[PDB]
């Protein structure tokens, strides 16, 4: 469904963001 | 029952300890770059001939050497499996494997997983088995031991830049650690009844008329190396329950001791080379406490067993549904925890056949990351990551700076620690979710209810952690599963060994310093408890929903 693919897209990009933030000392 | 079990676990640990101790001394000698007693001219001629004249390696060179050896082995084993209808030693003219199955088998063996989605009796041909799988079972174990050697050296070498010669470590670790011990155990299995011949499949007429065609290849050799290296990839479909592989109870016991021989000894050796044996005892105690709790749980659960048989009519009520008769329900349970926590993968009973708790504990031992006496090499540095994190949080909550064994723990090492410790559950959860979300992966199930979900979960947990065991009901030979699990094993292995070399490189430059007020003794029962808490809480928090929805739901039902 559209909602499912959009949700997983959001979660995926969010994990990319969190791992980036982790490796940083911003 | 409780008396036959307490005795079984008691004698197990006592014997293992004794063997691990002199072994520990020998591995310590090998990690002081010292040649073993009688092998110092042989070593000179062999290294000169191979062109490995001693010259140290920093962490980048060491890592690249290990990865290069592994990729070369992977290419060779892949192509070997694809073209096994051209290679000799093929009595039953079996054809070459597929591309998906060959890929999964190559990746699995090269990364010490030995995940089996085939049937060895009717797929491999005495040569992929002999020169394809056992060779891998040696090189994979050696690679793991090489990495932890480099890590221990990182801890003992003060303010330097060298980490040893990769090739000399591999050549020493294979030629003088694995081969002789393995050969010894191989002749032992041969004596007990195991098989070792290059004959064609024998023809057998029974006392009645039914026609049996016994498969008969080189089994003792593979058995010895697959257990001593914690590979877990067996010659037959039922990898270790088959009679030709595990014929007598004595052989079963030697298999368990061999399953732990090297990791326990590496804990001892690490405790020796640093000059302080208290450190080694702290480590061993931590792992052994978790181990005893888990064995007690599984034994108790299965001794209760299936309550339905009683009502159907059975005399006794013990879950003896997927367990050989050579051994009892006690040894079957013990071996389940031993292969699950030691990251070996060899099963002596079908794990799908256990009751809900018997399926929850082993799976959960795999998910935490194979740190309880884990895989040879891989397990100890897994529990180094957790020990470093444990001092990181202890110092953080007490309000001092974190220092371990004199070294100073920096934010950089911590970053890498978090990275590695998360790379494993990410694969687990993502893969299991993907499988459950697709009709293909969903169709491989063989059990309704939440147990069906437990199958998929367990499969991916074995793949990501390189355990190699499986619930075995899952028909995972389709290309979907082959590629999925191949990706999981490959990334699990290397994703978790690169940061270890990075942390080793960082700590090799650090210099050890004198005690302070931020130096909390890591030996004693306060760090032992701190560490157990770290591991168990990390694991529980990361997997409670899956576990709740899988085996637990089956249980309460």
């Amino acid at each position: 469904s559209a909602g499912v693919i959009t949700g997983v897209l959001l979660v995926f990009l969010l994990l990319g963001y969190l791992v980036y933030a982790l490796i940083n000392a911003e | 029952m409780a008396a036959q079990g307490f005795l079984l676990i008691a004698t197990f640990l006592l014997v293992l300890m004794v063997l691990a101790r002199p072994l520990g001394s020998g591995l310590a000698r090998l990690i002081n770059d010292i040649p073993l007693p009688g092998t110092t001219g042989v070593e000179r001629v062999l290294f000169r001939a191979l062109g490995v004249s001693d010259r140290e390696m920093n962490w980048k060179q060491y890592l690249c050497a290990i990865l290069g050896l592994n990729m070369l082995g992977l290419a060779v084993l892949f192509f070997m499996l694809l073209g096994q209808h051209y290679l000799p030693l093929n009595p039953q003219q079996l054809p070459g494997l597929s591309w998906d199955l060959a890929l999964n088998t190559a990746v699995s063996f090269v990364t010490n997983t030995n995940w089996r989605s085939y049937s060895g009796e009717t797929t491999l041909s005495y040569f992929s088995q002999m020169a394809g799988l056992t060779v891998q079972n040696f090189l994979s174990a050696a690679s793991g031991i090489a990495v932890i050697f480099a890590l221990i050296r990182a801890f003992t070498r003060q303010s330097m830049s060298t980490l040893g010669n990769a090739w000399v470590d591999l050549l020493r670790i294979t030629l003088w650690v694995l081969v002789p011990v393995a050969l010894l155990i191989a002749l032992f299995f041969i004596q007990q009844g195991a098989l070792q011949n290059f004959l064609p499949y024998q023809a057998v007429n029974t006392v009645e008329g039914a026609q049996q065609l016994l498969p008969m290849g080189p089994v003792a050799s593979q058995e010895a190396i697959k257990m001593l290296g914690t590979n877990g990839g067996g010659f037959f479909n039922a990898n270790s329950s088959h009679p030709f592989e595990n014929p007598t109870a004595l052989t079963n016991f030697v298999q368990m001791l061999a399953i732990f021989l090297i990791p326990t000894a590496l804990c001892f050796a690490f405790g020796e080379v640093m000059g302080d044996r208290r450190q080694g005892r702290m480590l061993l105690w931590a792992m052994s406490v978790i181990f005893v709790i888990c064995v007690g749980v599984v034994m108790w659960a299965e001794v209760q067993g299936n309550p339905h048989l009683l009502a159907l009519g059975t005399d006794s009520s013990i879950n003896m549904e997927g367990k050989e008769s050579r051994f009892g329900v006690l040894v079957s349970s013990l071996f389940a925890v031993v292969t699950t926590a030691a990251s070996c993968g060899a099963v002596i009973a079908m794990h799908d056949s256990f009751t809900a708790l018997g399926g929850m504990v082993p799976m959960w031992l795999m998910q935490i990351g194979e740190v309880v006496f884990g895989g040879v090499g891989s397990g100890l540095y897994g529990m180094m990551l957790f020990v470093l994190l444990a001092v990181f949080i202890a110092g953080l909550m007490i309000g001092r700076t974190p220092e371990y064994l004199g070294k100073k723990i920096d934010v950089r090492e911590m970053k890498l620690t978090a990275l590695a410790i998360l790379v494993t559950p990410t694969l687990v959860l993502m893969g299991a979710a993907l499988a459950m979300m697709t009709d293909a992966g969903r169709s491989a199930m063989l059990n309704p209810g939440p147990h069906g979900f437990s199958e998929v979960l367990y499969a991916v947990s074995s793949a990501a952690n390189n355990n190699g065991s499986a619930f075995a009901g899952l028909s995972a030979n389709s290309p979907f599963w082959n590629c999925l699990l191949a990706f999981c094993m490959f990334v699990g292995r290397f994703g978790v060994i690169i940061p270890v070399m990075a942390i080793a490189g960082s700590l090799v430059s650090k210099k050890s310093q004198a005690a302070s007020s931020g130096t909390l003794p890591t030996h004693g029962p306060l760090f032992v408890g701190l560490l157990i808490g770290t591991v168990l809480l990390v694991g529980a928090l990361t997997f409670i929903p899956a576990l709740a929805l899988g085996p637990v739901a089956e249980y309460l039902s």
């Binding site: - | 007490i398 978090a418 979710a433």
Partner: protein
């Protein structure tokens, strides 16, 4: 209260998403708030049937939590800006005397010195601060160049030679002097120091970044648990509603720690300002609690400043009593602290009360700068006092002779870190007056204390090597580095920062501004001006390095409070996990409903109470956080034992009973 409302308005302004992604966990709860509000909207007005009220309730609670956390941050920033304004708010009005016909001129235009440009001519006279950098073209005076070197000896600027470049800010002491503004108001020395401090930015303390790593790690773990928890439950049967899923996400991620971070910060700020030492943030307080090496300034930091007379050193058989009487009666009329100090020293070291009186018929002989010596003529006597060379010239010109042991004593007094004032009565040098610095007041014993704490001690000065060695030894520091221009200060402090050791700093002049700013914890004194106060996080009007020992102790205690509450947050979070899991799992397998431990009313009530407890954790943890727990000295092992025991048991027990009593409230009130 007013500050608190001001902070609330500021926090709601800070809602702006562009600023939300500064912290990770916050932006997480932010996007969660957004998702639940969108679901509540579409469900209530659109194609998604379900209970719109539950979604609106949960969404409001999430929004509320973001508001409270941002409000804590705003309160911290507001208190910091308030104290910054209260401490750095003073009247300022630099003035300069622009001249016409710049030979000498008499048209003094009181033009603000900031408005001066290059080529313009200025007049400065005794006491008036040098308006801006430049050069001298007429008149010779003795400038008080203490903000450049750190020394207090007046230096002669004399309109042509190598002593002709005055500096903006330094005070003039002796007499008139006309200046030629030879720098633009934008390229002055103060602007060089300002450019240096502005170019430097402080970094996060290791103890901060370490906690941050742990938080982001927990974030990843729980995110993956729930995100993947959706399809697992889907397979079995009815999928967990996305609303409960996102609610559980924000209930499980460690949101509480950011608010607790700011709470401990303001806690330390309150305690610190309560210890007569103002700060800029609890960040600086903990950095004070982990100081590894101190960077001190000899002048104006350790010593009170403005050194005055000290000990007398006569020549061969010159009746030291006579020397003291001569010095007393000579420096009588003087008003500068050095003359009064000579008078006090002589008068309290001997009995000469009779002779002091200002009614007697003596022509006071003040300083001239031609002969370069002050004095008096009381009765048939010509008492004079001044530099060694000035009196050498005077004696050699009066047909006398200058003994050599007087010069030996002069060299000695120079080697001891003091300016020697030779005294004469006619044509016979009576001796020397050593103007040593003021006293350290127990700093040697406190440096021994610092050594007991294993904290390095370092000096920074712009004096001669021998003088620096002498004064450093008398201070008790480990080593020294002299002639350290501000660039050398920064060079040393950064080369030491390369090792990773937290550096402490203190100093008063405009020359010490850059070093003060870069250091993670640097205190200041009242002697310094805005250049001092504006650079460096800390401040201490008392100018006593002793307090650094105390403030590292206080920092220790603040770290302990942070650690304990850091245990509370962790325990609370994990307790929320085990207390909420089954209550949420109530849609697919009823057996898991039987697994409930607290026996909450329903899954809706469960999640509601959970997020409620979430916001409650924030607000109700503010007071206990700002209060602070009393610490007693103990060893790391026992410190950990006690920390775990008290805070761990408290936390692990709290969320269970808390959610239970909130469930009692839910049931008896009947919100749903």
């Amino acid at each position: 209260p007013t500050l608190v409302v001001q902070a609330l308005k500021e926090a709601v302004k800070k809602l702006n998403p562009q600023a939300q992604w500064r912290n990770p966990v916050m932006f997480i709860v932010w996007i969660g708030s957004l998702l639940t509000t969108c679901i509540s909207i579409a469900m209530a007005s659109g194609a998604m049937p379900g209970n719109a009220l539950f979604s609106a309730a949960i969404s409001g609670w999430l929004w509320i939590t973001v508001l409270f956390a941002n409000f804590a941050e705003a309160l911290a920033e507001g208190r910091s800006k308030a104290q910054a304004n209260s401490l750095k708010g003073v009247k300022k009005t630099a003035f300069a005397r622009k001249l016409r016909e710049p030979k000498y001129g008499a048209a003094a235009d009181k033009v603000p010195a900031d408005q001066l440009r290059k080529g313009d001519i200025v007049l400065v006279e005794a006491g008036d601060i040098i308006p801006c950098d430049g050069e001298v073209i007429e008149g010779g005076a003795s400038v008080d160049e203490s903000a450049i070197t750190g020394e207090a000896a007046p230096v002669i600027r004399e309109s042509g030679g190598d002593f002709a470049s005055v500096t903006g800010g330094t005070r003039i002491l002796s007499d008139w002097l006309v200046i030629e503004c030879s720098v633009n108001p934008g390229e002055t020395f103060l602007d060089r120091m300002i450019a240096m401090v502005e170019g430097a930015q402080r970094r996060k303390t290791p103890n901060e970044i370490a906690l941050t790593i742990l938080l982001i790690a927990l974030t990843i773990v729980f995110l993956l648990a729930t995100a993947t928890l959706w399809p697992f439950s889907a397979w079995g049967g009815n999928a967990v509603s996305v609303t409960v899923l996102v609610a559980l996400l924000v209930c499980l991620i460690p949101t509480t720690i950011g608010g607790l971070l700011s709470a401990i910060g303001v806690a330390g700020m309150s305690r610190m300002l309560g210890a007569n030492v103002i700060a800029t943030s609890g960040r600086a307080v903990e950095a004070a609690g982990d100081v590894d090496v101190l960077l001190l300034d000899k002048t104006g930091t350790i010593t009170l400043g403005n050194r005055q007379a000290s000990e007398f050193i006569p020549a061969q058989g010159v009746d030291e009593k006579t020397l003291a009487d001569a010095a007393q009666l000579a420096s009588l009329a003087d008003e500068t602290p050095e003359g009064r100090s000579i008078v006090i020293l002589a008068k309290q070291r001997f009995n000469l009360r009779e002779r002091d009186v200002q009614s007697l018929h003596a022509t006071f002989v003040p300083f001239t700068a031609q002969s370069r010596m002050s004095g008096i003529n009381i009765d048939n006597r010509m008492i004079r006092k001044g530099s060694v060379d000035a009196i050498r010239r005077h004696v050699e010109a009066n047909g006398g002779h200058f003994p050599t042991d007087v010069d030996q004593k002069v060299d000695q007094v120079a080697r001891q870190g003091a300016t020697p004032l030779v005294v004469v009565e006619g044509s016979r040098v009576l001796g020397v007056i050593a103007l040593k610095d003021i006293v350290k007041g127990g700093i040697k014993e406190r440096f021994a204390q610092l050594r007991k704490m294993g904290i390095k001690t370092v000096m920074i000065t712009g004096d001669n090597r021998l003088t620096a060695a002498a004064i450093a030894a008398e201070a008790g520091v480990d080593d020294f580095l002299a002639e350290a221009t501000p660039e050398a200060k920064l060079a040393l402090i950064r080369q030491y920062q390369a090792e990773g050791r937290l550096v402490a700093m203190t100093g008063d002049g405009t020359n010490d501004a850059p070093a003060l700013a870069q250091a993670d914890v640097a205190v200041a004194m009242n002697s310094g001006t805005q250049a001092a106060k504006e650079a460096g996080n800390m401040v201490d009007l008392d100018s006593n390095p002793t307090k650094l020992i105390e403030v590292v102790h206080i920092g220790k205690q603040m770290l302990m409070t942070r650690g304990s509450l850091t245990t509370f947050s962790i325990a609370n979070d994990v307790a929320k996990y085990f207390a909420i899991i089954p209550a949420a799992f109530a849609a697919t397998y009823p057996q898991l409903n039987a697994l409930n431990i607290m026996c909450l009313h329903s899954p809706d009530s469960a999640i509601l109470s959970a997020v409620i407890f979430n916001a409650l954790i924030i607000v109700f943890l503010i007071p206990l956080a700002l209060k602070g727990v009393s610490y007693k000295p103990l060893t790391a092992s026992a410190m950990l034992r006690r920390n775990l025991w008290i805070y761990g048991l408290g936390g692990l027990l709290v969320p269970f009973i808390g959610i239970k009593v909130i469930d009692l409230l839910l049931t008896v009130c009947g919100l749903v």
